[PDB]
Amino acid sequence: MFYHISLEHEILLHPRYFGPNLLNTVKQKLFTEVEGTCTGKYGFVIAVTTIDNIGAGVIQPGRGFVLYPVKYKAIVFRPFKGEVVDAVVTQVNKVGLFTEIGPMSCFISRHSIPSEMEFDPNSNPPCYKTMDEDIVIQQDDEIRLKIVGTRVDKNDIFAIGSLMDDYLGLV
Amino acid sequence: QANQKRITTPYMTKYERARVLGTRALQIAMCAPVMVELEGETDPLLIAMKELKARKIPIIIRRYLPDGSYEDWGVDELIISD
Amino acid sequence: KPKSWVRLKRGIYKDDIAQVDYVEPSQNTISLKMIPRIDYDRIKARMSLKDWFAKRKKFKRPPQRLFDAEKIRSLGGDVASDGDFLIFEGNRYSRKGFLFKSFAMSAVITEGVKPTLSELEKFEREHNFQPGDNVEVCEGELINLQGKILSVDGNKITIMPKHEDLKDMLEFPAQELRKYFKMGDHVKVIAGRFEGDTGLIVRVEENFVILFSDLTMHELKVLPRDLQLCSETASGVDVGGQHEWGELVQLDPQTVGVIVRLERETFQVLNMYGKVVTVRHQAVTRKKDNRFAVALDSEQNNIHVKDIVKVIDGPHSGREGEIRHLFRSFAFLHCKKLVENGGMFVCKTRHLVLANELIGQTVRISQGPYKGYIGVVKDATESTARVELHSTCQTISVDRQRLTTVGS
Amino acid sequence: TRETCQGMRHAIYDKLDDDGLIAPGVRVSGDDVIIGKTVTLPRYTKRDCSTFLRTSETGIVDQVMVTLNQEGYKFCKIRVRSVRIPQ
Amino acid sequence: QPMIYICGECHTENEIKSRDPIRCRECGYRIMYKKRTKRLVVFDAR
Amino acid sequence: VRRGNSQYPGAKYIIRDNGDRIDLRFHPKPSDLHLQTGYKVERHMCDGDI
Ligand SMILES: [Zn+2]
């Protein structure tokens, strides 16, 4: 789920940039720092919209650097358990289906698929299908999935989804 | 402690002088842009002393009161005796 | 007790794990079944046991291997059969290969003895409850209640579970206590087919929990009791310190790689070419790291290790990493933001871009203000030397053009 | 020798004679070996445990005495002389 | 190779081999002294 | 740094921004005598030092 939240980050500055363009290099470093990161407490950080304020930096004794507390408003994508979201199928195989929700990637286990669906190794594009073949999900399809779990890996949370509930299928 | 009425001494203390000169010298040594004409000067401490006499050190002294508040003084707003 | 693991104090069988067969307190001797230690070279040369003991001082003890009757037949040794057991050199050997022998109780060790898992394999109730784990009450009046393991004990754990909307703590023993977890939550397996692994459970069957390993998208079913809940990530610490994370290794002389992932049995070592190949612990042998080296780059500037560089070209594009190992035409980069390959990848060196013979000899100073003095050269560069003077208690620096070595 | 013994400092050992001892009349400086001694391990099979001249001192070997101690082990004493000019 | 030592009592030079115990072959004395070096010794006369 | 640790008004170490110390006693390869702006040189104490 995408969110707009205000966060705070302290950027260290080498005395090299104690020049007229200091405030600009401060925000440039903030952008380079926070953008693209992921955290369990706040989820993925998609982009930095604005900078609310730059605090007065401090000179740390002995060290040359100056530290600035930079409060900033950013876009974050945090999923949740029990949440229905759209996803994009990117690879389909016999084991299951692999989808993407923004930066996150999801894998749908056989126990999360309705009993009508059955694995078919014989098909050239592997896919999930039932005998009626009313609904067919293949690569690049749009699906609606329920998030069942959250697992954080190397500062990168990954989620497992589900489509087992009613009305969750290719629309 | 609104800087409208700063109640601490308008003179830079000897401790403030010592620490400001040292901190600015370290900054110069780390290629911080200089604020005065260096004509034939190379030692970072001597350059920092020149900047102090010129009232050009880009540093603010934050003086904490016992009560917990503080006052911010630009290094150029203080009287330098020694 | 019968069928117990013990060890030996002295003798040629010392430091050998053994299993008890029978104990006779009256005779002060016990029977231990263990792996025989027999030397095949001795059988080939047909040496007497007494002669082996006479010259035992400089003779190495044989290793541990399962007894084979066919092997001795080829070597010419005599093998006798006595029912299930086999008699060889006045000792009874089992058909499987285990050696049955009797030894004094005093020599045998019966306290503080603990076999290893590897040892048990050759010879071939418990509970796992830790603080911070959710447990259920399978049996008893209060059923279908999940509580946290506040305390721990041995046979009778006597945990103080905290159930939902229940501030008070109850009392339950080990047998009544059961390990249960909810769907879609982290779970860790201390013991199992693939121990030390983490995954998420899509469902919880009554006795066959199903989880998916992060290592590979494959099912892993283990007993729920063996399962545990742990928000902490899987450490994956190696056993015995054979290697270390981010360490260069020489799988083959031409190809050199860095181990990026550590597992219980397999290894995922990243080679120079950038692909991922799986290997075992024994096969991979360590290689020293080039603490100093040289290379080349597109900019035609010197590059050393531990320098920040940008991959402007090559397999990767717009990628930043820190060099950890260097090769003639390859270099290993490090990072912390990269999920793939444990944060470590490899790119070509060129594609990367910037982002003594006189020592100890005796010399006569032949020119200058110290002419005539004599000394021993303690250190010499290509132009200047340090000469300890025989007469002045001082070591001086002298231009090498002012020295002549004194010959014997 | 550096092939067999392991813990050898970077000090030269060429001032020693074949008996492992320096000879009288040799100039010595701080961190110079004067008694070469190795202990066999339980760069292989030998650990250097040589005696070095005290750091910052210098002189000339005055005399070298070799004996057996009470328990019959070989035993050496080395006297180093240093001329001191008042300063 | 020779390793000549001087006996402390009878002043007799005599060969000694490493691992050979210290003992004068003439008088049996157990204290011996090494001979002066053959290296070049040069002093300023100051 | 060219003078090294043996000619008195010389230097003993080069410390690079990476933090690795280059010992100028065990005379190292001339490529390791290279100085750039980030580095520091542990020079011998000289006249006028405080
Ligand atoms: Zn004698």
PDB file of C-alpha atoms in Angstrom, chain D residues 14-15 17-19 21-26 60 63-68 74, chain E residues 1 3 5 18-22 30-37 39 41 43:
ATOM      1  CA  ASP D  14      75.013 -13.261  10.327  1.00  0.00           C
ATOM      2  CA  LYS D  15      76.889 -11.833  13.302  1.00  0.00           C
ATOM      3  CA  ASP D  17      79.061 -17.980  14.636  1.00  0.00           C
ATOM      4  CA  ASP D  18      78.088 -21.530  13.719  1.00  0.00           C
ATOM      5  CA  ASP D  19      77.677 -22.331  17.424  1.00  0.00           C
ATOM      6  CA  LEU D  21      77.008 -17.285  19.577  1.00  0.00           C
ATOM      7  CA  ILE D  22      78.527 -13.930  18.740  1.00  0.00           C
ATOM      8  CA  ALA D  23      82.287 -13.596  18.962  1.00  0.00           C
ATOM      9  CA  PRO D  24      84.302 -11.113  21.054  1.00  0.00           C
ATOM     10  CA  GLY D  25      85.194  -7.965  19.152  1.00  0.00           C
ATOM     11  CA  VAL D  26      82.002  -7.693  17.087  1.00  0.00           C
ATOM     12  CA  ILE D  60      81.359  -4.218  21.285  1.00  0.00           C
ATOM     13  CA  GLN D  63      84.054 -11.768  25.995  1.00  0.00           C
ATOM     14  CA  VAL D  64      81.946 -14.898  25.629  1.00  0.00           C
ATOM     15  CA  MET D  65      81.962 -17.645  28.265  1.00  0.00           C
ATOM     16  CA  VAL D  66      80.468 -21.115  27.726  1.00  0.00           C
ATOM     17  CA  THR D  67      79.853 -23.698  30.471  1.00  0.00           C
ATOM     18  CA  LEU D  68      77.315 -26.129  31.867  1.00  0.00           C
ATOM     19  CA  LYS D  74      74.948 -25.665  28.027  1.00  0.00           C
TER      20      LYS D  74
ATOM     21  CA  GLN E   1      83.243 -25.652  11.859  1.00  0.00           C
ATOM     22  CA  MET E   3      84.794 -23.520  16.814  1.00  0.00           C
ATOM     23  CA  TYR E   5      87.461 -22.372  22.618  1.00  0.00           C
ATOM     24  CA  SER E  18      77.667 -28.161  18.834  1.00  0.00           C
ATOM     25  CA  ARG E  19      75.786 -30.715  20.959  1.00  0.00           C
ATOM     26  CA  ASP E  20      79.162 -31.674  22.487  1.00  0.00           C
ATOM     27  CA  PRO E  21      79.335 -30.893  26.232  1.00  0.00           C
ATOM     28  CA  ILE E  22      81.801 -28.275  27.427  1.00  0.00           C
ATOM     29  CA  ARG E  30      84.179 -26.835  32.348  1.00  0.00           C
ATOM     30  CA  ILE E  31      84.622 -23.098  31.590  1.00  0.00           C
ATOM     31  CA  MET E  32      85.781 -22.009  28.142  1.00  0.00           C
ATOM     32  CA  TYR E  33      86.005 -18.702  26.297  1.00  0.00           C
ATOM     33  CA  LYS E  34      85.509 -17.870  22.640  1.00  0.00           C
ATOM     34  CA  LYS E  35      88.406 -16.490  20.655  1.00  0.00           C
ATOM     35  CA  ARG E  36      88.511 -12.959  19.322  1.00  0.00           C
ATOM     36  CA  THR E  37      86.725 -12.401  16.021  1.00  0.00           C
ATOM     37  CA  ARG E  39      86.212  -9.445  11.441  1.00  0.00           C
ATOM     38  CA  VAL E  41      87.872  -3.945  13.874  1.00  0.00           C
ATOM     39  CA  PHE E  43      88.674   2.549  15.744  1.00  0.00           C
TER      40      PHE E  43
END
